[PDB]
Design a protein around this ligand. Structure first.
Ligand code: FAD
Ligand code: FAD
Ligand code: FAD
Ligand code: CA
Ligand code: CA
Ligand code: CA
Lengths: 538, 538, 538
């Protein structure tokens, strides 16, 4: 009955450990002060790597949410309906405290780093569910700092490990999600162009009339929303339900039909005299949310890195099994070269991101705070931009089967641009880097110290330092991407030189910084890279 | 911001008790020997009536199953993927033993009646999930009677309360489902036209080559399949997995794209030297499955009745709330007339079906067995045919909102024809009734006795008995539907006269049997009918 | 490579002549004064019966319209996007003047009858596209009678044979469609409960604020819309574009997700100070549209009849080819009986509808006008109610293949209830019949004359006349359906007795009016019925 036998078809990667298979991550977690979380990380790495877990990710994306503007009786409903897989993903994210680990009372030293490792494991399985998690993690410290009086009973659920999908006022719920409404049709990068208007009421609250053009996670229990007041652009707490239990006047008009990120609901919304509570002062909306923005930019970089890691893991498991021209694909000199360069890129990214996580963890230290202020937008720019060609290359390793929606690769590929577009996109990251280099007291000293610490170790690194120094003499706005990319590489290189094995740091520096390419990697480096990326080290 | 206020929109029926709201059913359960099950029935009636339960029914139908013929590597898979709601429905059906209550060791007197009541509650929530349940309930006694030796370890899971969706040989599973493969492209009514061929192997098993054109529940652990042998048309046990653990050679070719019944997978399949085990003798396939057929025909009648009951319950809850021309719709004389006639039809159907369930329960008694043999096809014909106009009328009570897929009514309406088409359809039921009346020893005596028992109580009933007697003098095949319908009504009428209150039996007889219509129901009868249909009695 | 041979599978009906195959229709067209249209009818009957034509019907339903509330820039759009098949269907409908043949200057005697025959041919191919056609045909004479001054240039396009899908003010278009906005969330039967409000402006036009809950064909160039004024419920011309070229303020909020009629867009809409022009006087909205309603009710009856005709034609073509138990299915005594009864029902319906079409054609005659006033709602009630069980029976002739969406039968079945629900639904038709019988001068005389004309010809007919006479003594509202059904049958019977062959009229009267059923049809009648239904006569 058959016309052929099927052979030389790799088995797809599943039922693996997402943590234990990543040598660079395991090393970074210990190095950066989160080793106490390693047993937990191995545990969730196993749970998240199962066929069942990966299926929840697939189901949540192929059954995207449905906007319910009205009920069957023609009354306004303004709700969103998700596939059950979505709620199961949210439950595990919250159980694992990806939304608030760092903010717990008695959080231990390294909690920001431990939380980043947890986030990176989840992000490999499914990306859309990270959006509410990212916004809630970033908004929580600000909300706890400024929590308006009628919402004092939100502190307990903000600190829980309990996802709660009930359509109830937040104070009645066991856990909460918080979103961000900034972008308007006339601009997302330039939020001063916002026309949503807030008028102060007798009781000190404000009435808002306007719109937000991309308003993710409409089901959040509140959104922090930018609006204009007499005193300038300001930040408001806009809860889904008012203190009295009535629904607030946020009208969900249309759900975005997106390239990727499809599991996540993003809406176009309008405020019809919605009630908001001013956070901070009138006119300080942009300043107030700077650090909130910093944390979301970090998560963008970490998310793209995580997706690159998953795509790479799929590619290498496939290339190990697939034979071409009589030999394993991973043994073919050109393929082995390409995959080894990919692995080297992920090693550097992991070292940089986790050092950056430690900086955010230790931000009570002014120099750590400054390092995070400078390298966060740099990391978002370079890593998020790299995501697209990196994932395409992984897909090409698999070949035609990597172009079919049955594979994880298309979904990863379709996700990659979102992280690059988020929060003013790549150019805004670079202009922010230039602003910091220009205006921030202490920056040039911080950089010099970091670079002197490793001076003499590598000729390519030292040449790149001199090139950046020259470039910073006249930092033209048109060179913002060149400068940001150079700065990012020097950050990565300094971490590699300090902490990677010497042959690895040497390989990294030559590949990344030796201005003439044509760099061949030694056999031993390629072997070590590919072994480290499949477990080996942990 | 609003253009209007929404008013006079009924709230849709949910969070009600499917059992306690049905006076006729509660009375029938006690009358027919299953009163010991009443507490359980009230419990599951509450569970099944919740918004959450009704949502599982919706989800399983709007997310229909997907046929997986191949995996991503191009190897044959032959599997079906369902929405999780489907599996949750199956779990509750099996927990409630709708597939096997009557067949348990130590099953108590009335178990067939108790099982019918349980089935009727489930059928109101979701219909497609009743297909595997119906086939498994009907096939189980036959399989236990004839179970081939290599499958002796199936007896325990056949008797469990555990749904098991694992892709494993049945002997390794905690519970089992059994299907039926009869229909071929050239005929489903006339199964002797089957061309699927079975050849005897050295070990006594047979190799099958052929097709089945409608093959529901392909995921069943076995199907009973008709095939031709040297000795005539025969019945085979065809398991999904062979005794050695290999998949059997059943190729799933195409999933039907159906009007209704969409939650249930129905496939077109081909046998490529599939292995089957002969049940019974060569050439006795048609005879062997007669009683199996009887049970499935009963479930068809019961299913259509249940859907009619749900549609009626929705219509009356709506008409009680909706106002037209200044008064409740249920108070408008013409609407109240129509709904009262509907209620009266369901009273008769409930009385007949449960008497029939008792007949099947007590089938060790030759007269009970004969009553079931005769009235089962009659009930399937009339009740399944009535389903379509009855549900359309309920939809029209709701008006335009009953035509929208948000309402339960369209799904009920789209389901109704399947039960009428099943197992040779309406004409085959009537030809079977004629065959029984002609050939079956004892029938005319059984009928006479039943009719004499109530003779003198109602003039319309006694006139209808005389009309049937005349008709049976020359029972032409072309009058098969007229005769079947008359017989059905006399069955219903005898139950009403014996057991309904006299004004109710009087109303039933005049409406159903008074050859000139124009029958107006008294105010008291309409009130009692509509109250009984909303709980009152239980 | 094969497991079986496919055989005994009928070829599906296509490439047939929808007109020439229908003996009763061809005879009715000539009888009722539209014989001059017979060549044209045969021509379009051929065109509409092709596989390509039937495919347009399928495509328009499986690719339903999409509501475009906003454009990609977030500006309001309020438009609907259709599959190209929809526009091709509309083009042929308008070329054939199904929307206005009767209203042309110099329309010839019999034009209403010719238009009804044309409508019936189209309705067999696709039903949703008849909605704009029906509303435009019904509204056109009223609009031409009352056309408000700023829209004088609409007269030419209202009278064209040119469908025009351009998004332009009607006065710039080559042809126009008109819709009807009556139903609100609180009621469609009782339109006096409408809360949409119209306020008179300085220039004599009115500003409307409110909603309509089912608002079909939102893309119409205008809708006639009921709204409350100081002077009572009134009818407004509400154009899609104002005289100055601006879009009118009609907000399309949601598209209905329907059981059937899926090719046709039906919206929930809101008026945000939309401009309307009063037709007639304040407070005469209900009266003004009575005749408009009459024409749409006629089209409902004609549409259900047409769908029944298509379903029957499919069933008989199938049963002629399919063999069961060694003989053609159409030769099996019970099946032949059932199909013959079906054919007889269509013969009566065709005779009645076309006599009714002639009444509407000759409505300058007071007695013809009265016949149409009385029999139109009666016909809508009985015929539209019959549609559901009739089409289900056809599906059951085909068997399981008739339950699959590849067949035309499911789409026909899912369409049938809409015609029964339309314009206040079945109960409102019956209450209207009772109102006419009670209040309308001349009615009892008109009926007596009609009945005396055929008195003595058939005993069952004469007995039914006496039964109706008795019933009309005390015409209780609760007997509205019994009375309407009796009246309808007497209408049909009088046409059959006057114009059918005597054996046919005899067969009709006995089957339809002989209060004890068990009526067997002669061999010759069954043969003549089935031959007439496949062409024979034309
Ligand atoms: C899936 C998804 C979900 C989203 N969810 C949210 C949400 O929940 N909340 C929210 O507020 N927003 C959300 N956004 C919107 C997102 O933040 C914006 O798209 C982003 O800030 C860019 O704004 P914009 O699209 O208006 O582009 P613009 O601001 O018009 O920018 C266009 C391009 O110009 C570049 N540019 C801008 N200014 C300069 C300059 N001075 N010099 C050089 N280049 C410049 C930008 O970098 C960008 O590349 C979401 C977006 C997506 C895709
Ligand atoms: C959703 C669905 C699921 C199904 N699942 C299964 C399944 O799991 N297993 C399986 O075996 N089948 C299944 N069936 C097929 C079903 O049993 C058949 O469709 C049914 O038996 C009718 O057979 P048929 O379609 O070949 O019609 P035919 O046998 O061709 O009958 C067509 C019509 O002719 C009538 N007729 C037949 N013989 C006579 C006669 N002698 N005199 C007068 N009238 C006659 C029939 O009553 C019917 O109305 C399924 C069907 C559906 C719709
Ligand atoms: C596909 C579709 C398209 C439609 N398009 C349009 C459109 O374009 N324009 C428009 O105006 N409407 C439209 N309608 C609405 C349609 O006209 C209404 O649904 C219909 O008039 C019934 O009104 P309702 O749904 O409010 O039911 P109700 O008025 O609430 O009636 C419910 C039931 O009660 C019965 N009833 C009402 N009064 C009495 C009484 N006095 N005594 C006894 N019984 C009574 C009715 O007959 C009906 O069976 C559309 C409907 C559908 C399904
Ligand atoms: Ca090698
Ligand atoms: Ca009353
Ligand atoms: Ca014959």
């Amino acid at each position: 009955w058959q016309t052929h036998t099927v052979f030389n078809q790799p088995i797809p990667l599943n039922n693996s450990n997402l943590y234990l298979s990543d040598g660079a991550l395991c090393e970074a977690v210990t190095r950066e002060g989160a080793g106490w979380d390693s047993d937990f990380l191995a545990s969730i790495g196993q749970q998240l790597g199962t066929a069942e877990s990966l299926e929840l990710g697939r189901l949540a994306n192929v059954n995207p949410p449905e906007l319910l503007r009205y009920d069957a009786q023609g009354r306004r409903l303004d709700d969103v309906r998700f596939h059950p897989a979505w709620h199961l993903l949210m439950q595990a994210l919250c159980t694992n405290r990806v939304h608030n680990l760092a903010w717990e009372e008695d959080a231990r030293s390294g909690a920001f780093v431990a939380r980043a490792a947890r986030f990176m494991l989840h992000a490999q399985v499914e990306a859309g569910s990270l959006c509410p998690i990212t916004m809630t993690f970033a908004a929580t410290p600000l909300l706890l700092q400024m929590l308006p009086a009628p919402f004092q009973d939100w502190t307990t659920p903000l600190l829980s490990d309990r996802y709660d999908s009930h359509l109830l006022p937040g104070g009645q719920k066991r856990g909460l999600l918080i979103g961000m409404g900034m972008t308007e049709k006339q601009g997302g990068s330039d939020v001063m162009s916002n026309t949503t208007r807030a008028e102060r009421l007798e009781d000190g609250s404000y009435r808002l009339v306007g719109h937000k053009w991309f308003f993710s996670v409409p089901q959040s229990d509140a959104h922090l929303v930018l609006a204009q007041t007499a005193g300038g652009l300001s930040c408001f707490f806009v809860p889904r339900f008012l203190p009295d239990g009535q629904r607030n006047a946020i009208r969900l008009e249309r759900l975005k039909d997106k390239l990727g990120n499809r599991s996540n609901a993003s809406c176009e919304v309008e405020f019809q005299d919605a009630i908001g509570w001013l956070l901070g002062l009138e006119g300080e909306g942009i300043r107030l949310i700077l650090k909130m923005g910093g944390m979301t930019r970090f998560d963008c970089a970490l998310g793209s890195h995580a997706m690159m890691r998953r795509a790479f893991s799929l590619a290498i498991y496939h290339a190990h099994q697939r034979h071409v021209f009589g030999n394993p694909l991973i043994q073919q000199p050109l393929m082995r070269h390409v995959l080894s360069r990919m692995a080297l890129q992920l090693e550097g990214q992991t070292a940089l991101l986790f050092r950056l996580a430690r900086a955010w963890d230790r931000r009570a230290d002014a120099k750590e705070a400054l390092w995070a202020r400078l390298f966060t937008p740099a990391a978002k720019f370079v890593i998020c931009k790299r995501g697209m060609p990196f994932v395409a290359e992984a897909m090409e390793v698999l070949g035609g089967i990597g172009y079919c929606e049955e594979s994880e690769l298309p979904r990863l590929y379709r996700e990659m641009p979102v992280n690059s577009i988020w929060e003013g996109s790549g150019n805004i990251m670079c202009l922010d880097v230039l602003r910091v280099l220009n205006k921030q007291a202490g920056v040039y000293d911080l950089l010099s110290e970091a670079f002197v610490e490793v001076k003499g170790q590598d000729r390519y690194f030292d040449r790149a330092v001199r090139r950046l120094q020259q470039q910073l003499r006249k930092p033209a706005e048109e060179l913002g991407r060149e400068i940001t990319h150079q700065l990012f590489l020097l950050g990565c290189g300094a971490q590699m030189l300090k902490y990677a094995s010497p042959p690895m740091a040497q390989a990294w520096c030559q590949v990344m910084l030796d201005t003439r390419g044509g760099v061949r990697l030694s056999e031993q480096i390629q072997n070590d890279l590919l072994l480290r990326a499949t477990g080996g080290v942990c």
